[PDB]
Coordinates of C-alpha atoms and ligand atoms in Angstrom, one line a residue:
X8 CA -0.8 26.5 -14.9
X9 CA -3.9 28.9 -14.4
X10 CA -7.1 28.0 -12.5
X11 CA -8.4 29.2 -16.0
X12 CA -5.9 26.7 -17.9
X13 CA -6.9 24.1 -15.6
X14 CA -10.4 24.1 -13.5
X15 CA -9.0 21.1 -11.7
X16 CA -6.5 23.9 -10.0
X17 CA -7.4 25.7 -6.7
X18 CA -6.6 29.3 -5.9
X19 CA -2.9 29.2 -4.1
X20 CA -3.9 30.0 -0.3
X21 CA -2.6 33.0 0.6
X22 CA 0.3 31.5 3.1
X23 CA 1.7 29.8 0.2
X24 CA 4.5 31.4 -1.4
X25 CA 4.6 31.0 -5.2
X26 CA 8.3 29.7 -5.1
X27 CA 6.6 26.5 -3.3
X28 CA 4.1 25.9 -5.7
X29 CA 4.4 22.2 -7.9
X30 CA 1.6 21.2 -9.1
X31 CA 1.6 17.5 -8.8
X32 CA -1.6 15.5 -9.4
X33 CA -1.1 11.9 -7.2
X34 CA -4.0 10.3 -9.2
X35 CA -2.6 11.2 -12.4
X36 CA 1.6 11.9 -12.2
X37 CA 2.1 13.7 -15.4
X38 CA 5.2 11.4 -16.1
X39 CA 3.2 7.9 -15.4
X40 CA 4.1 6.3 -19.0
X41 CA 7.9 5.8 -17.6
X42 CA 6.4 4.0 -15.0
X43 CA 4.4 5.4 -11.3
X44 CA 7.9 5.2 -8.9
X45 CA 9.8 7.2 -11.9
X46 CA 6.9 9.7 -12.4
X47 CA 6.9 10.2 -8.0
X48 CA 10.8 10.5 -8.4
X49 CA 10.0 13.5 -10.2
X50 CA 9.5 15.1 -6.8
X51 CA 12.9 14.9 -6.4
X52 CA 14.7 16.6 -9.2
X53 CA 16.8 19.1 -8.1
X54 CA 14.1 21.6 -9.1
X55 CA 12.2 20.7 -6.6
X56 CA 12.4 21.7 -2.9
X57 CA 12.2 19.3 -0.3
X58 CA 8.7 20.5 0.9
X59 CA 5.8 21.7 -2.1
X60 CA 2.4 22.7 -2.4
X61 CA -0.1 21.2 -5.5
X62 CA -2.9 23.2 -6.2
X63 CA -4.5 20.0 -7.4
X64 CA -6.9 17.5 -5.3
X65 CA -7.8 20.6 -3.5
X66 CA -4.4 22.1 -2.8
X67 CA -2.1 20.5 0.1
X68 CA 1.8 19.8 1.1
X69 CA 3.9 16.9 0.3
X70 CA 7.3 16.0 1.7
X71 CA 9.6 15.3 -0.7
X72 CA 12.5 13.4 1.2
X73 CA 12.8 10.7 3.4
X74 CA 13.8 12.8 6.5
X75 CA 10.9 14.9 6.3
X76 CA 8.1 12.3 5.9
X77 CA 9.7 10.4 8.5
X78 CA 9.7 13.2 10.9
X79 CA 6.2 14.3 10.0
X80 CA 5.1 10.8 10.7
X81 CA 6.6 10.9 13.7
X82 CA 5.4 14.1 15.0
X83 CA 1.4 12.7 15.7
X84 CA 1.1 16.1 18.0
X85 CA 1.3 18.7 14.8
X86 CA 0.6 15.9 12.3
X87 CA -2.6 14.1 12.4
X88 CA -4.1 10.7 11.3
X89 CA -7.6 12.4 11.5
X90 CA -7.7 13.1 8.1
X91 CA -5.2 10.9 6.4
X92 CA -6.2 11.1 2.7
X93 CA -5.9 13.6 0.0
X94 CA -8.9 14.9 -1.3
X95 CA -10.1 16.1 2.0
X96 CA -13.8 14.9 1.2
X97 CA -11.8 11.6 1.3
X98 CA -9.6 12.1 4.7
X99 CA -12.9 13.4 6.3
X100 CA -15.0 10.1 5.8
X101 CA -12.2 8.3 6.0
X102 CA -12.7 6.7 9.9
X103 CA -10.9 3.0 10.0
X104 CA -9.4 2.4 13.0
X105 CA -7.2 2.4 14.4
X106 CA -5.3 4.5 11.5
X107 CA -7.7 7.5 11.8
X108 CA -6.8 8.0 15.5
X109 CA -3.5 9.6 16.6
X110 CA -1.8 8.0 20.4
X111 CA -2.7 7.0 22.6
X112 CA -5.6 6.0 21.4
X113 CA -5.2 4.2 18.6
X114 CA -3.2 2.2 21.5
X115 CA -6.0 -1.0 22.3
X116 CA -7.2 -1.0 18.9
X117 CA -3.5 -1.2 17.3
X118 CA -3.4 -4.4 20.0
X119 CA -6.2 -6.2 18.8
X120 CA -5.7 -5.8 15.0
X121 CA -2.6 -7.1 15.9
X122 CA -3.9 -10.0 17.2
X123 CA -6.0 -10.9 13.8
X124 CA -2.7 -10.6 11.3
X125 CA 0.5 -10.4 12.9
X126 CA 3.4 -13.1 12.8
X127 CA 2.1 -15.9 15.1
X128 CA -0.9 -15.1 12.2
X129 CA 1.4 -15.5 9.5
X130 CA 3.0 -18.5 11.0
X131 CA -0.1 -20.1 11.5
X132 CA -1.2 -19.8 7.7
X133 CA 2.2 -20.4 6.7
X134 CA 1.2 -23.6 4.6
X135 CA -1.6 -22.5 3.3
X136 CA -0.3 -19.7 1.8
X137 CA 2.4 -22.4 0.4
X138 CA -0.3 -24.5 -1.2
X139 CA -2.2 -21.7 -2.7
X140 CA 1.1 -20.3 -4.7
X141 CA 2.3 -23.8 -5.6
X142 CA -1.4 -24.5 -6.6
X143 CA -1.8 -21.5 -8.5
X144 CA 1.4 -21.3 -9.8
X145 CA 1.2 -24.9 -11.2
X146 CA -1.8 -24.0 -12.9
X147 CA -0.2 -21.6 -15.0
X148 CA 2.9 -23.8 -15.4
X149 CA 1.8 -25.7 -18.5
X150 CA 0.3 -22.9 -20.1
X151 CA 3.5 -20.1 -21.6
X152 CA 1.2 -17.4 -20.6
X153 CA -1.0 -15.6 -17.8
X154 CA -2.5 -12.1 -17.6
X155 CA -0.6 -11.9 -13.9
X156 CA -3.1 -9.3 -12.3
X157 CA -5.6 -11.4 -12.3
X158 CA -4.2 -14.8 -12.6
X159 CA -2.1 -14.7 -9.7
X160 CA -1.1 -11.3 -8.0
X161 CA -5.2 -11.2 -7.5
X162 CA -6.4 -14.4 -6.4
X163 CA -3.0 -15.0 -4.3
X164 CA -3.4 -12.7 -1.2
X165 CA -7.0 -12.2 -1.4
X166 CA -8.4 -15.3 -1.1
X167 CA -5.3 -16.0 1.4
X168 CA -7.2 -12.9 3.7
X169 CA -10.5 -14.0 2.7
X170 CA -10.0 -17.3 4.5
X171 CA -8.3 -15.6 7.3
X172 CA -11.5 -13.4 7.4
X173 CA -13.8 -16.3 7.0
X174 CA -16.0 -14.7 3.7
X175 CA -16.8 -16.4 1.3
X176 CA -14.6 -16.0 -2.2
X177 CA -17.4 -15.3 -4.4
X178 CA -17.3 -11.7 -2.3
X179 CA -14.3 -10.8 -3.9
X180 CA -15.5 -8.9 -6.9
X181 CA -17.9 -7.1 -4.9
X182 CA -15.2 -6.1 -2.2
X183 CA -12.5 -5.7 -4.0
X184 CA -14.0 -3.1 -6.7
X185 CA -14.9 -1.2 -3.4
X186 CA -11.2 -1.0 -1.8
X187 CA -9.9 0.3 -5.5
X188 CA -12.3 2.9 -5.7
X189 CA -10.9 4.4 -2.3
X190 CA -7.4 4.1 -3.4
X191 CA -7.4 4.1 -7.3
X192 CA -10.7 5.9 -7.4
X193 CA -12.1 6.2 -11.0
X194 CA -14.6 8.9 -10.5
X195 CA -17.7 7.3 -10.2
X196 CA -17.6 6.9 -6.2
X197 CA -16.9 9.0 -3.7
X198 CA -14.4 7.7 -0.6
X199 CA -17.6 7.9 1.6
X200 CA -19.9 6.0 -1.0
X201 CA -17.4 3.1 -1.0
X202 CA -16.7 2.7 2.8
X203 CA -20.5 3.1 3.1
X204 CA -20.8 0.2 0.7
X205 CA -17.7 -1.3 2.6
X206 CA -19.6 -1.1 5.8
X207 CA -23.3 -2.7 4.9
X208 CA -21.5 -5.2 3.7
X209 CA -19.4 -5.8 7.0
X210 CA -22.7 -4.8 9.3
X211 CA -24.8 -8.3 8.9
X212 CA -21.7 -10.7 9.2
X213 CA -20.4 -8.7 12.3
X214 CA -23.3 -9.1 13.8
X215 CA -24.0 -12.5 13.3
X216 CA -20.2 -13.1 14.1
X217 CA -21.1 -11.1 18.0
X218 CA -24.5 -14.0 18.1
X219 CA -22.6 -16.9 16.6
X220 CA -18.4 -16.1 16.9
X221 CA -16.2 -18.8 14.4
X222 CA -12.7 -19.0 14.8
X223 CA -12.1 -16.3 11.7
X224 CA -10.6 -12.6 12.0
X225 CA -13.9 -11.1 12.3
X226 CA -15.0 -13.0 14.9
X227 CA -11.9 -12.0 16.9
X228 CA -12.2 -8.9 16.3
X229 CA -15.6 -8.3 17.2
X230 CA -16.0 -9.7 20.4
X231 CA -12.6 -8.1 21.5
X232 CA -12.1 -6.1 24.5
X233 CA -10.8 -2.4 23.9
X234 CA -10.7 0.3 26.7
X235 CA -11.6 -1.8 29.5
X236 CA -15.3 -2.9 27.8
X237 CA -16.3 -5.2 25.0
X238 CA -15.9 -3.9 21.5
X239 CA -19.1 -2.6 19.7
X240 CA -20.4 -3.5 16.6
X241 CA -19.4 -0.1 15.0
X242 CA -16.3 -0.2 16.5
X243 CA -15.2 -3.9 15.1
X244 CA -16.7 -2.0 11.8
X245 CA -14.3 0.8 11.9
X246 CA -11.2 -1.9 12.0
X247 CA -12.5 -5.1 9.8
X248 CA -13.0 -2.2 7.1
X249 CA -9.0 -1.1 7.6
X250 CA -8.5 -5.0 7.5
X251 CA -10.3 -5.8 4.0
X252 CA -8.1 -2.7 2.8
X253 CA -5.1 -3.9 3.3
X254 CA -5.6 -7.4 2.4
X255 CA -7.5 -6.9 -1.1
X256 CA -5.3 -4.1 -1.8
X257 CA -2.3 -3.8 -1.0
X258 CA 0.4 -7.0 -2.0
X259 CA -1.8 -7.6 -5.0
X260 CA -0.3 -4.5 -6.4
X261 CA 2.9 -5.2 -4.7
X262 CA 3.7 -8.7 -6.6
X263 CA 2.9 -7.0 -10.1
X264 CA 5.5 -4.4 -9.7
X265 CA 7.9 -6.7 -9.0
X266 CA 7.2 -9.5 -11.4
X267 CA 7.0 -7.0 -14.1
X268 CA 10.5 -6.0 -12.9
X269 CA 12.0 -9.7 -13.0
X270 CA 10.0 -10.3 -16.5
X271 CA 12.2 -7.3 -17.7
X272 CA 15.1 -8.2 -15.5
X273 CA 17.0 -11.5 -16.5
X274 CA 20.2 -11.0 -14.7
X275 CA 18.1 -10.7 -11.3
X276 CA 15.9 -13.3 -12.0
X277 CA 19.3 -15.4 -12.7
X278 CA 20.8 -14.3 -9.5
X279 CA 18.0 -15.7 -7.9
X280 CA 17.5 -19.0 -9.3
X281 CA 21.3 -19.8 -9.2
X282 CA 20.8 -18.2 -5.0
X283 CA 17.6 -19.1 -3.8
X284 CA 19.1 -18.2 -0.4
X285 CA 18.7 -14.6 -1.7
X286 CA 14.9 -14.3 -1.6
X287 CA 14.1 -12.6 1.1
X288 CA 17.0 -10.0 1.0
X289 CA 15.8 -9.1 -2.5
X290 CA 12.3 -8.7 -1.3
X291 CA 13.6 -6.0 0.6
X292 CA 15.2 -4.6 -2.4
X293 CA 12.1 -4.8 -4.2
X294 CA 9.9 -3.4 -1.5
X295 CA 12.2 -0.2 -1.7
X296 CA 12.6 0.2 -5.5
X297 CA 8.5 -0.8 -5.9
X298 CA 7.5 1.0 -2.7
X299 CA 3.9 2.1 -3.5
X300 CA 1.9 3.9 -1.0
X301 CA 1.1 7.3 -0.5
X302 CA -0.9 8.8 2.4
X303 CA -0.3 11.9 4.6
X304 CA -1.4 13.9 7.6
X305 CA -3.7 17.2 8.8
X306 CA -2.8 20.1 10.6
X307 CA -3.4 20.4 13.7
X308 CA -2.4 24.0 14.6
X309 CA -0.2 26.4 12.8
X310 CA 3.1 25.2 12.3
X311 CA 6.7 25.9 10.9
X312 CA 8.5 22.7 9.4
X313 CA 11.9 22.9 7.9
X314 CA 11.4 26.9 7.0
X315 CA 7.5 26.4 6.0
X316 CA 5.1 27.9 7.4
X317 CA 2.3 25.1 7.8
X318 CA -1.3 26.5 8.7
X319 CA -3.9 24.5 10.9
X320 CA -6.1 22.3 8.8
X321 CA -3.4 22.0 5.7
X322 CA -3.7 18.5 4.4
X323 CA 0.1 17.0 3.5
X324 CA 0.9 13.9 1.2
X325 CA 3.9 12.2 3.2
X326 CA 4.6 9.7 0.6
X327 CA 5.9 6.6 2.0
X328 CA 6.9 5.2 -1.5
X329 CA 9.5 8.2 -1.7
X330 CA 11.7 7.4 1.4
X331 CA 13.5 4.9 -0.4
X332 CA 13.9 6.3 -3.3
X333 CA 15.6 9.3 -1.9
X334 CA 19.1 9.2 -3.4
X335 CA 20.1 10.4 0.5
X336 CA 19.0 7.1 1.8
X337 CA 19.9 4.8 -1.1
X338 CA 22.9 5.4 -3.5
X339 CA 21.6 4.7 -7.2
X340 CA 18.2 4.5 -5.7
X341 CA 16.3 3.6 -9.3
X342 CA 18.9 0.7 -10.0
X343 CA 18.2 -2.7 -8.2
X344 CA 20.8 -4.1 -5.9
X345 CA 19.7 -7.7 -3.7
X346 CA 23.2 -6.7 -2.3
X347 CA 22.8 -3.2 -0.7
X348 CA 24.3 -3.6 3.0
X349 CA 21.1 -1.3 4.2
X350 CA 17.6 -1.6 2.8
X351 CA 16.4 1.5 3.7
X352 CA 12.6 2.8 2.8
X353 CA 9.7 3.9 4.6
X354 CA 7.5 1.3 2.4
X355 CA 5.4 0.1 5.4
X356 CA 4.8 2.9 7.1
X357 CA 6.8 4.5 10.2
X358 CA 5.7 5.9 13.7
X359 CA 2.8 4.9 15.7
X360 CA 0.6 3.5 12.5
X361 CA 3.7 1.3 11.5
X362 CA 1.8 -1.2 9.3
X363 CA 0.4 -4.7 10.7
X364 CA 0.2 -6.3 7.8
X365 CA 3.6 -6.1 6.8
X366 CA 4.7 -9.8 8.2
X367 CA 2.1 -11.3 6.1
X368 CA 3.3 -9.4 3.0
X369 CA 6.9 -10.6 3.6
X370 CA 5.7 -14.3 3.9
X371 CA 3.5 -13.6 0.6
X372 CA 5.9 -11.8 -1.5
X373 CA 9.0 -14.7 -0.7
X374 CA 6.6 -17.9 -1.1
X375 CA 5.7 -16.2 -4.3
X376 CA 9.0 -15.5 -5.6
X377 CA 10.6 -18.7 -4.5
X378 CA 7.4 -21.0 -5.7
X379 CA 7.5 -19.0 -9.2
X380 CA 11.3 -19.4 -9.9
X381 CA 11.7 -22.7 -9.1
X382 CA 8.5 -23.5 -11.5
X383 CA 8.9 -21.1 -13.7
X384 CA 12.3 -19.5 -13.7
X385 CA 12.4 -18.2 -17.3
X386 CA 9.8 -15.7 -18.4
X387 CA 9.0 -12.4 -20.4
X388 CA 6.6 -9.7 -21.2
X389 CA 3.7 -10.6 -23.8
X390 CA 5.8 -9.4 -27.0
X391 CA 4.8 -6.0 -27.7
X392 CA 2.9 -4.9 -24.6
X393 CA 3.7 -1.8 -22.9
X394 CA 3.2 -1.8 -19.3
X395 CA 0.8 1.0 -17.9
X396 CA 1.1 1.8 -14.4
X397 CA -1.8 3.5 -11.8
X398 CA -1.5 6.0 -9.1
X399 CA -3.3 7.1 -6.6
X400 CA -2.9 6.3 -1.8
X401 CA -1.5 2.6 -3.6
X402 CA -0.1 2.7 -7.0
X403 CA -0.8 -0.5 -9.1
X404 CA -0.2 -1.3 -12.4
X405 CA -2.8 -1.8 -14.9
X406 CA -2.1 -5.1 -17.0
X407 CA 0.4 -7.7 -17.0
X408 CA 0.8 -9.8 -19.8
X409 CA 3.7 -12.5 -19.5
X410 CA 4.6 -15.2 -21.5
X411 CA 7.4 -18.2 -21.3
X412 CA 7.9 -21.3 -23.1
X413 CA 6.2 -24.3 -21.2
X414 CA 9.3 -26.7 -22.0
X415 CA 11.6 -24.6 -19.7
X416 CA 9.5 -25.2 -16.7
X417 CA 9.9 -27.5 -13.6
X418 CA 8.1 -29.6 -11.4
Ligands
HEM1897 C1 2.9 -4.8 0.5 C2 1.8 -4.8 1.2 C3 1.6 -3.6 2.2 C4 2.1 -2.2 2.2 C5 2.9 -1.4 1.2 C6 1.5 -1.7 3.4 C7 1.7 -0.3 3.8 C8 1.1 0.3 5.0 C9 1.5 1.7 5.3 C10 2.3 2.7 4.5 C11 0.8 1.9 6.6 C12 0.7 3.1 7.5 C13 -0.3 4.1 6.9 C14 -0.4 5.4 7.7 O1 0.5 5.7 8.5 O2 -1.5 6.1 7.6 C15 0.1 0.6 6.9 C16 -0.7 0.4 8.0 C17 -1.5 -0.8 8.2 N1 -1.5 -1.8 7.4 FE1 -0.2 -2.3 5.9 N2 0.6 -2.5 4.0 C18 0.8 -3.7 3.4 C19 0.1 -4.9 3.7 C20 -1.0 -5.0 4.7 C21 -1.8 -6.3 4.8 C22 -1.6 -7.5 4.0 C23 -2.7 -6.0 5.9 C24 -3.7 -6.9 6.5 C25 -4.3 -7.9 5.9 C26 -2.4 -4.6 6.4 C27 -2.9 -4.0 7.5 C28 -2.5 -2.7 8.0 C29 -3.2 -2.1 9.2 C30 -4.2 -2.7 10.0 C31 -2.5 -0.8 9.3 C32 -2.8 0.3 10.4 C33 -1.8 0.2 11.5 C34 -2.2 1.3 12.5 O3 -2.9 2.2 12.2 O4 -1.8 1.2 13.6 N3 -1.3 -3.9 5.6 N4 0.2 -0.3 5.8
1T4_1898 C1 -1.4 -6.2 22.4 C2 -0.1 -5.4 22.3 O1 0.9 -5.7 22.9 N1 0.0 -4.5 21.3 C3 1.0 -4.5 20.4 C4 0.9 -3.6 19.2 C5 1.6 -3.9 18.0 C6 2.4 -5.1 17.9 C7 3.0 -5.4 16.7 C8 3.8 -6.6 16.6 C9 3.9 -7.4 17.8 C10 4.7 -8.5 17.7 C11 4.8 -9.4 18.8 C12 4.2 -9.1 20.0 C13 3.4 -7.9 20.1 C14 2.8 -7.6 21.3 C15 2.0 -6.5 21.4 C16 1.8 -5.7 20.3 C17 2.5 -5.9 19.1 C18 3.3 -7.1 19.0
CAM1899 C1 -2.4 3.4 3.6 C2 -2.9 2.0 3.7 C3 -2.0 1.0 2.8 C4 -2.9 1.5 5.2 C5 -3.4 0.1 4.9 C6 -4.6 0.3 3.9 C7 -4.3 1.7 3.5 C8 -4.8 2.1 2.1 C9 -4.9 2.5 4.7 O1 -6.0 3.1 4.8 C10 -4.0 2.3 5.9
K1900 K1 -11.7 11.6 9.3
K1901 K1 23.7 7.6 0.6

């Protein structure tokens, strides 16, 4: 409440009024137990205003409502990519491209990630990704059990990007330990101890892959054209670290959410076996109600949003995860509906960083849903577990122990 109850508090700068003040802690939502979207939602009490300062992780904004964190994340000229992550140690090291540069420039680079995992991407892989889940999936099958984080919502999509990057899958420990600790960091590394970790890593392979090119995303990307002249090595660096982000990290967390949800949901799971047809509109759903990413902007000058006064060099948390679950976007915004006429959630981003990605997660998240309810339809939690979610720039969930009887399940 204090800087001298809590030492993790900073002094209230001196623009803030006190009236503003909520001192929400992203990495650790004091109502996580009831799950990480219910402890965000918090943020929208009607206690809260729609715009708040947290003296914790150094002190800066977040948006509370959809209409706000859209509009910031449309407005690139006051609200900047430079320094997209909250602590601002973090959202200074952090320099991916092309999300750490606002337009135009992210422009050339936004083209060529593009060209490494958008839809004729997805398309391409579409089979693939088909015979990993059915593989996986009828692995488990016999068993009437799995740890899902690891068994599945793991191995899945990373070793679906790690073939589209062309590493090797024994890498995957190694990598993906280094993308948690710059979303879900633990303490023990720094943002800028990780990406440097993320980069020697990336450094030998790009440069073999600029002597000897395969046909793999790196290669692509590295002997690109940006700006009218061959990519450089650092360059290719900056974007294949953005791209081993995203893929290690982001629909790995995704699937949990929403298995969890159908484990503890029959009547949705039902709906879905008896309408197969259904999949990809509940995705949607699910995508809203299990919407997990949070990152934000920096001030570019002095500013006045919605009655605020904003100072230059202000960090603010616009998190995409709360779009959707603003009750002035979506009626009954907690409850689950494959039905709702409009879908509407910021979950992938919005503006000029829109994600890339997202038509890969789509083709993920359905092949996994339809290739686990036609195999394994009926299912549960592990008798007894409690879930426990994570927060942090993409919320996760910690453990997911799920069990079914082996006789119910289909070939
Ligand atoms: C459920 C899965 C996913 C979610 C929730 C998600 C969410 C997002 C969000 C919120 C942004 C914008 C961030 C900002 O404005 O600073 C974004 C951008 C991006 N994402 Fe996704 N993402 C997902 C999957 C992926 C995958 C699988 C990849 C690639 C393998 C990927 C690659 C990208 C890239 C490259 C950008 C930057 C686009 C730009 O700066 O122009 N994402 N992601
Ligand atoms: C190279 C370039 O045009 N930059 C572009 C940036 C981002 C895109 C996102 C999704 C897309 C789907 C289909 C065609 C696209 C063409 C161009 C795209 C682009 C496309
Ligand atoms: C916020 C993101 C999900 C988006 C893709 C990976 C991520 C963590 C970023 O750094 C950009
Ligand atoms: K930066
Ligand atoms: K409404």
């Amino acid at each position: 409440e204090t800087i001298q109850s809590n030492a993790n508090l900073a002094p209230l700068p001196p623009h803030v009024p006190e009236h503003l003040v909520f001192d929400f802690d992203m990495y650790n939502p004091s109502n996580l137990s009831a799950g990480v979207q219910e402890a965000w939602a918090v943020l929208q009490e009607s206690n809260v205003p729609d715009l708040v300062w947290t003296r914790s992780n150094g002190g800066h904004w977040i948006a509370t409502r959809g209409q706000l964190i859209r509009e910031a994340y449309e407005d690139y000229r006051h609200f900047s990519s430079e320094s997209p992550f909250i602590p601002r140690e973090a959202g200074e090291a952090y320099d991916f491209i092309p999300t750490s540069m606002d337009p135009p420039e992210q422009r050339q680079f936004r083209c060529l990630a593009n060209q490494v995992v958008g839809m004729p991407v997805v398309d391409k892989l579409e089979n693939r990704i088909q015979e990993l889940a059915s593989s996986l999936i009828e692995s488990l099958r016999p068993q009437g059990q799995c740890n899902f984080t690891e068994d599945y919502a793991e191995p899945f999509p990373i070793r679906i990007f790690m073939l589209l990057a062309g590493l090797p899958e024994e890498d995957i420990p190694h990598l993906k330990y280094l993308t948690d600790q710059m979303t879900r960091p633990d303490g023990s590394m720094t943002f800028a101890e990780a990406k440097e970790a993320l980069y020697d890593y990336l450094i030998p392979i790009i440069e073999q892959r600029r002597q000897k090119p395969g046909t793999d995303a790196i290669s692509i990307v590295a002997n690109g054209q940006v700006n009218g002249r061959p990519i450089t090595s650092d360059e290719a660096k900056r974007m294949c670290g953005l791209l081993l982000v995203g893929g290690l990290d982001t629909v790995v967390n995704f699937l949990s959410f929403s298995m969890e949800f159908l484990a503890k949901s029959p009547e949705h799971r039902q709906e879905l076996i008896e309408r197969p047809e259904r999949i990809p509109a509940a995705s949607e759903e699910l995508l809203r109600r299990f919407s997990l990413v949070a990152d934000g902007r920096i001030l570019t000058s002095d500013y006045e949003f919605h009655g605020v006064q904003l100072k230059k060099g202000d960090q603010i948390l616009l998190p995409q995860m709360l779009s959707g679950l603003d009750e002035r976007e979506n009626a009954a915004p907690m409850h689950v509906d494959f039905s709702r006429q409009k879908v509407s959630h910021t979950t992938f981003g919005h503006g000029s960083h829109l994600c890339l990605g997202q038509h890969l997660a789509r083709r993920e998240i359905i092949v996994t849903l339809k290739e686990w309810l036609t195999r394994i339809p009926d299912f549960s939690i592990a008798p007894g577990a409690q879930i426990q979610h994570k927060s942090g720039i993409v919320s996760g969930v910690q453990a997911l122990p799920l069990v079914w009887d082996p006789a119910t399940t289909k070939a």
